[PDB]
Amino acid sequence: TSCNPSDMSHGYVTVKPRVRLHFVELGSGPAVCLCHGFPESWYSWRYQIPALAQAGYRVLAMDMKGYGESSAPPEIEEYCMEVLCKEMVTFLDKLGLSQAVFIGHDWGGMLVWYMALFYPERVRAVASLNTPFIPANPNMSPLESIKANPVFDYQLYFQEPGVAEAELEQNLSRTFKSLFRASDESVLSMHKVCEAGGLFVNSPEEPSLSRMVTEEEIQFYVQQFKKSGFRGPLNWYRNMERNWKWACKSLGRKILIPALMVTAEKDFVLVPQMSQHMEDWIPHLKRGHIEDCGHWTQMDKPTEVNQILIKWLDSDAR
Amino acid sequence: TSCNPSDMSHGYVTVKPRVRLHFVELGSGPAVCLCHGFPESWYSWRYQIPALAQAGYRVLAMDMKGYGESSAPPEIEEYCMEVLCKEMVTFLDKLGLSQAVFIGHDWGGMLVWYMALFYPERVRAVASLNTPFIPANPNMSPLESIKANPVFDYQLYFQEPGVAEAELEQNLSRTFKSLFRASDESVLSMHKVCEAGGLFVNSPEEPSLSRMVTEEEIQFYVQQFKKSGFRGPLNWYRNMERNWKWACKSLGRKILIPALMVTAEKDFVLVPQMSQHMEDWIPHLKRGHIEDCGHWTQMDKPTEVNQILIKWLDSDAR
Ligand SMILES: CCNC(=O)Nc1cccc2ccccc12
Numbered sequence: 001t002s003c004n005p006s007d008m009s010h011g012y013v014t015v016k017p018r019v020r021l022h023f024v025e026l027g028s029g030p031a032v033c034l035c036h037g038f039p040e041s042w043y044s045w046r047y048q049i050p051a052l053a054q055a056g057y058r059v060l061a062m063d064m065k066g067y068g069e070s071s072a073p074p075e076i077e078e079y080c081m082e083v084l085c086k087e088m089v090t091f092l093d094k095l096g097l098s099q100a101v102f103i104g105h106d107w108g109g110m111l112v113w114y115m116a117l118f119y120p121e122r123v124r125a126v127a128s129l130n131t132p133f134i135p136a137n138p139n140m141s142p143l144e145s146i147k148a149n150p151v152f153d154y155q156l157y158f159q160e161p162g163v164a165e166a167e168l169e170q171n172l173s174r175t176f177k178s179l180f181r182a183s184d185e186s187v188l189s190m191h192k193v194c195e196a197g198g199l200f201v202n203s204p205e206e207p208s209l210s211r212m213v214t215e216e217e218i219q220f221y222v223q224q225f226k227k228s229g230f231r232g233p234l235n236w237y238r239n240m241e242r243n244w245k246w247a248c249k250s251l252g253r254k255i256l257i258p259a260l261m262v263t264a265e266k267d268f269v270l271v272p273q274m275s276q277h278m279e280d281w282i283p284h285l286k287r288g289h290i291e292d293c294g295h296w297t298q299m300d301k302p303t304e305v306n307q308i309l310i311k312w313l314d315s316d317a318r
Numbered sequence: 319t320s321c322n323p324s325d326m327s328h329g330y331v332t333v334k335p336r337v338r339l340h341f342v343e344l345g346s347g348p349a350v351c352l353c354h355g356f357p358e359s360w361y362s363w364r365y366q367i368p369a370l371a372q373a374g375y376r377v378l379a380m381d382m383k384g385y386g387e388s389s390a391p392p393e394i395e396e397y398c399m400e401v402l403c404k405e406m407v408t409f410l411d412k413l414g415l416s417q418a419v420f421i422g423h424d425w426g427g428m429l430v431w432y433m434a435l436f437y438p439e440r441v442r443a444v445a446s447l448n449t450p451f452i453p454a455n456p457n458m459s460p461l462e463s464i465k466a467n468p469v470f471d472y473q474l475y476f477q478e479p480g481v482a483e484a485e486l487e488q489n490l491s492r493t494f495k496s497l498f499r500a501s502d503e504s505v506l507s508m509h510k511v512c513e514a515g516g517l518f519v520n521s522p523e524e525p526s527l528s529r530m531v532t533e534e535e536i537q538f539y540v541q542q543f544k545k546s547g548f549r550g551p552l553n554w555y556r557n558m559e560r561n562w563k564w565a566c567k568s569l570g571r572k573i574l575i576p577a578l579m580v581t582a583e584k585d586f587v588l589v590p591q592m593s594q595h596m597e598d599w600i601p602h603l604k605r606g607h608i609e610d611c612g613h614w615t616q617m618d619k620p621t622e623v624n625q626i627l628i629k630w631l632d633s634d635a636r
């Protein structure tokens with residue numbers, strides 16, 4: 001079971017005069033906020049939305065700041081974790097929600113950890129797909145940390161505004177077809193990007209459609225990204241100095257609320273090994289692991305994600 | 319406590335191609351659907367929305383078909399009880415709501431009774447402000463019943479398309495200032511409206527502001543009615559025979575779900591005596607009565623409306 005955009009309830013919350021956030025809503029019961037990653041949409045949760053609502057939950061699948069129908073200001077400062085988390089709290093206030101279960105993937109996963117860290121009174125429970133929780137080191141710089149591991153090469157390529165924007169916007173159909181693939185079907189070399197010139201360097205001009213996605217699904221991402229482009233989505237990566245300084249202010253405090261860390265076996269960037277020793281800083285931490293699952297966790301193994309999320313929600317969040 | 323439109327969560331549900339239903343959403347818990355009357359808005363529930371949300375309820379204040387941000391087709395048939403009720407069922411389906419407590423006023427009150435009558439499985443509990451539930455007599459004609467009562471003379475004036483629209487749209491500021499008044503402040507005589515050839519005859523050109531409303535509140539209704547006018551709202555009255563024929567299909571069946579009948583002492587059109595013997599057709603009917611309260615119930619006595627609704631929701635709807 002998937003989602004048809006015309007058959008969904010579309011909600012709009014003005015968090016700031018310049019910032020309006022779009023979301024889809026399905027089901028009744030406890031509020032469950034779904035936060036997608038880069039370069040995604042609310043549509044990335046298409047298989048989770050009817051499954052979680054059927055399970056007995058009020059699903060609020062977000063269109064993150066800079067994505068789809070949500071506002072996309074050009075400023076880099078507008079995409080730091082501090083302002084992004086603040087808006088999500090304002091989103092809960094304007095909807096009359098005291099608490100909500102926050103589930104995130106990729107960049108959304110990073111947001112949900114900081115939402116649980118800085119606002120535990122507004123987050124009932126926290127779940128993250130692929131993205132682990134690493135407390136910021138005050139004696140270590142955020143720039144040299146990305147330079148240390150060769151897999152985060154594309155991150156430095158994403159820093160300069162306009163450089164990644166022109167490549168990703170060049171051909172939207174080619175962009176999502178090359179990105180949304182299973183690990184065995186993938187051709188993207190994340191280890192070396194800056195030297196290669198771009199991300200779709202080894203990718204063909206007309207790539208084949210992956211087994212996880214259809215032509216209709218790919219074209220929805222194409223139409224959504226025509227509204228604002230890639231500037232807003234890429235700006236999430238351009239706040240390494242601001243995010244590090246804000247995270248160092250928490251230092252000592254822990255995420256005491258019920259947590260769930262879901263690792264993807266085939267994610268070569270957000271490797272399952274990165275999630276090690278997370279229970280030292282998170283006492284009520286639960287785990288989930290998906291075999292043959294790449295980076296696009298929701299699209300790759302929807303049945304496995306639905307099973308783990310529902311089981312954890314009914315036992316630890318309810 | 320009231321509602322500010324810019325700070326509200328705006329939801330949109332496309333129930334039919336050409337028909338999109340707008341609503342404001344606040345709070346968590348059981349779904350509470352609020353249905354306004356003629357010539358109103360979701361804003362008529364401005365005092366109820368924060369009160370019910372604070373009480374522990376998920377408030378869904380509707381912009382009824384033909385009002386404000388909701389779709390307004392010009393077809394008369396599009397505003398009969400049958401198609402209006404079916405669209406509200408589809409509204410619950412697309413939002414993933416199996417049940418919702420329906421609270422209505424005026425035409426919204428007539429809609430909620432028919433939602434409880436034909437779709438009791440989707441109506442958790444039913445409440446109505448001023449509007450009683452009278453079963454349709456298959457031997458009695460709809461035009462004969464309205465003509466027999468001198469108070470329903472204005473309904474005959476509302477029949478011919480364009481006639482009542484031209485008067486109500488002539489001066490929107492005058493329209494809402496003349497209509498939204500407490501019974502003692504009323505400048506409109508609902509008797510002999512056809513004889514006078516208009517509703518605003520005894521009413522002055524520049525009417526004074528009522529004690530219930532401010533200038534800011536009046537201007538909101540003006541701006542909302544600039545979008546589609548009065549054709550859609552007036553079409554709710556132009557389906558007498560269609561509503562009678564559909565109601566006759568229920569014949570003999572009782573509303574077995576929990577129900578609330580709230581009467582307004584000073585409503586001279588929907589008089590408290592019209593609600594007599596309602597318990598014969600509704601076995602589990604609870605009552606409410608507001609003294610010194612005119613037709614604009616929510617506006618006139620907000621504190622009393624909130625006290626009665628919350629008390630009943632906590633004991634019968636939950
Ligand atoms: C929080 C940092 N996470 C990311 O940058 N994730 C990714 C973004 C875009 C393409 C990818 C392709 C493979 C793996 C991860 C990818």
Ligand SMILES: CCNC(=O)Nc1cccc2ccccc12
Binds near residue numbers: 356587613
């Ligand atoms: C379902 C039938 N109810 C109505 O027609 N209600 C009314 C509509 C417009 C103005 C009014 C003014 C006073 C009382 C009732 C009024």
